[PDB]
Ligand binder design. Structure first.
Ligand code: 2WY
Ligand code: S6P
Length: 585
């Protein structure tokens, strides 16, 4: 019947109690799974939220058990990392005509960007010409914008890759997709494989290839799964690589900006730095050079979450200011400013939040007086301002800007990174009562700009900010168990996540979930055979423009009622979250 093909890949909803014996659950990609540790995230207080997320984050470093998924520390992964270092090196030895591309959509593209800069700094620092570039879905503007719609075109990925790959002779394309999901990346990998004289593709993500997306890509003939399966075959001859450890599910189901983004840095910085230090030593990269770096990153989780109580506090003050319709500001210097801005933007699509609700600033790029004159005026008793810097920063810029803000608001808080035995100028010190200071041991660093110190701090800040922004919103009751029910459908992945969530929370059939979703999307238009047969992009484009789509679909199912009825029931309830919560009961 119409819509049969569009929806063929969808698994049937399991009967009550057999979620598993169906094999529905064994098919849920790890990156889409519910994390058992957070099944009551919607009840944890600030302190537990920090603990549960710090624990989810810990799973990146957890080793493989004995019939189960390879992980970061597994020998198959580390060995692939070695052989990939190997190949970066070949390009490091012939810079002329050589290029290294790091590419993803959304947070994967964001991660790509940071790391491209870093490794270009390192090559510059040695007086060599920078060989790194990034690519992000929607172009460069996406790096600091919520633009969830642009990951959906394979042609567009291939375009940008063709652009940047100019008249280069040797090109390493590291396609980064956490879910092994983004059509943007799928197209690049496939293009690399049709020209391995020039291209070497390395696919990075955190699902088994058996769980990679297998739904049709609208501008492309093969699926992500097929693309990845073919890369895996080429790996035996070292012409493609698939680097895909399991890190376990996200604490907020499907929120791959968290662990997936963190693991992406951890994995690739490790690997790239190894390749660099070892080319200079004229020695092959080895599992042992990778491990040193991996273990430093693992200390970095420990170090970072040593400050949990102060993390939970800042969480409370972020959450308060948002429950009172105030705003939260994130002010930080160099690369940590950038990470600040990434976190705030991501709250827009992740939580349905205003750009002003949690916003980031670099000293978006608003310098000292500029920020003092324009942003500083608009503050308020209930707002929160957050300062994020190292002690190698312009601490005279810092204390000034804090001085002004202190009058306009008292809920200030800071996150400061020091090597041991650096001290905080006593003015600054007096301005913060419980400060989140994170002090790092000394480590022997090979290069000019201490790139290993940079990676530790960026990562630790990411964890802190992610855990804060995410927990702030959970506290406001806006998450259901460990799902964001009320998301904006802005791409095909998110369409599938909505449909899966409808099956999960209603328990009702596939066909009914699909119908209720399309009805809620296209209302006031009824279901026609055209709509049923439409490509998924048509549904996304209409759904993107609307509110409460998923809650309305779910009410419809729960009350076995029409869209008209569900909408009017929603409007006659204190809140979305109450309407849904009470219908589920
Ligand atoms: O397009 S799919 O091949 N893959 C997506 C996916 C794969 C890899 C990374 C992210 C997302 C997906 C597959 C999938 C299977 C079970 C439950 C949720 C699911 O989400 C797909 C496969 C099966 C699906 C489904 C979608 O829609 C939701 C309901 C379950 O049936
Ligand atoms: O890396 P993927 O699986 O291809 O995901 C790419 C993007 O959808 C993803 O990063 C999204 O922007 C984030 O909001 C997920 O929290």
């Amino acid at each position: 019947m119409p819509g049969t093909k569009r929806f063929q890949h969808v698994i049937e909803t399991p009967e009550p109690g057999k979620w598993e014996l169906s094999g529905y659950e064994a098919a849920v990609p790890i990156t889409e799974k519910s994390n058992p540790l957070t099944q009551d995230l919607d009840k944890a207080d600030a302190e537990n939220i920090v603990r549960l997320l710090g624990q989810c984050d810990a799973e990146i470093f957890q080793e493989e058990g004995q019939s189960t998924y390879q992980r970061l520390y597994s020998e198959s992964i580390l060995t692939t990392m070695v052989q990939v270092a190997g190949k970066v090196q070949e390009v490091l030895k012939e810079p002329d005509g050589g290029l290294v591309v790091l590419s993803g959509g959304g947070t994967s593209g964001r991660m790509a960007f940071l790391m491209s800069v870093s490794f270009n700094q390192l090559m510059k620092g040695l007086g060599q010409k920078p060989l790194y570039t990034y690519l992000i879905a929607g172009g460069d503007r996406s790096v600091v914008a919520s633009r969830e719609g642009t990951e959906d075109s394979a042609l567009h990925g291939i375009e940008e890759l063709k652009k940047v790959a100019a008249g280069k002779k040797r090109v390493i394309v590291i396609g980064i997709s956490v879910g092994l999901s983004a059509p943007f990346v799928a197209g690049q990998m496939d293009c690399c494989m049709n020209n391995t004289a020039v291209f070497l593709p390395v696919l990075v993500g955190f699902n088994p290839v058996s769980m990679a997306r297998n739904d049709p890509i609208e501008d492309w003939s093969s699926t992500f799964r097929q693309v990845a399966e073919r890369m895996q075959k080429m790996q035996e001859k070292q012409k493609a690589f698939v680097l895909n450890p399991a890190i376990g599910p996200e604490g907020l189901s499907g929120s791959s900006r968290m662990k997936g983004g963190s693991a992406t840095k951890i994995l690739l910085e490790t690997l790239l730095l190894a390749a660099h230090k070892t080319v200079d030593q004229g020695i092959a990269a080895s599992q042992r050079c990778l491990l040193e770096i991996l273990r430093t990153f693992e200390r970095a989780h420990q170090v970072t979450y040593s400050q949990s109580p102060k993390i939970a506090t800042l969480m409370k003050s972020v959450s308060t200011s948002l429950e009172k319709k105030g705003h939260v500001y994130l002010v930080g210097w160099q690369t940590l400013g950038i990470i600040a801005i990434m976190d705030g933007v991501e709250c827009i699509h992740t939580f349905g939040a205003d750009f002003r609700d949690v916003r980031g600033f670099l000293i978006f790029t608003f310098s000292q007086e500029d920020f003092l004159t324009s942003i500083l005026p608009s503050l308020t008793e209930i707002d929160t301002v957050v300062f994020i810097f190292t002690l190698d920063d312009n601490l005279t810029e810092v204390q000034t800007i804090v001085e002004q803000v202190k009058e306009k608001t008292n809920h200030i808080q800071a996150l400061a990174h020091s090597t041991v035995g650096q001290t905080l100028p006593i003015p600054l010190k007096k301005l913060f009562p419980s400060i989140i200071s994170i002090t790092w041991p000394l480590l022997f660093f090979e290069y000019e700009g201490n790139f290993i110190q940079k990676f530790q701090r960026e990562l630790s800040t990411k964890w802190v900010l992610n855990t804060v922004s995410t927990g702030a919103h959970v506290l406001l009751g806006k998450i259901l168990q460990n799902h964001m029910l009320d998301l904006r459908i802005s791409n095909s992945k998110l369409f599938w996540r909505a449909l899966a969530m409808l099956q999960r929370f209603s328990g009702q059939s596939k066909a009914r979930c699909i119908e209720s979703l399309l009805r809620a999307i296209h209302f006031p238009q009824p279901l026609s055979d055209d709509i049923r047969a439409a490509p998924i992009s048509c549904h996304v484009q209409v759904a993107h423009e609307k509110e409460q789509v998923i809650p309305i679909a779910l009410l419809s199912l729960l009350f076995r009622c029409s869209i008209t009825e569900a909408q009017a029931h929603l409007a006659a309830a204190p809140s979305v979250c109450e309407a849904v919560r009470s219908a589920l009961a």
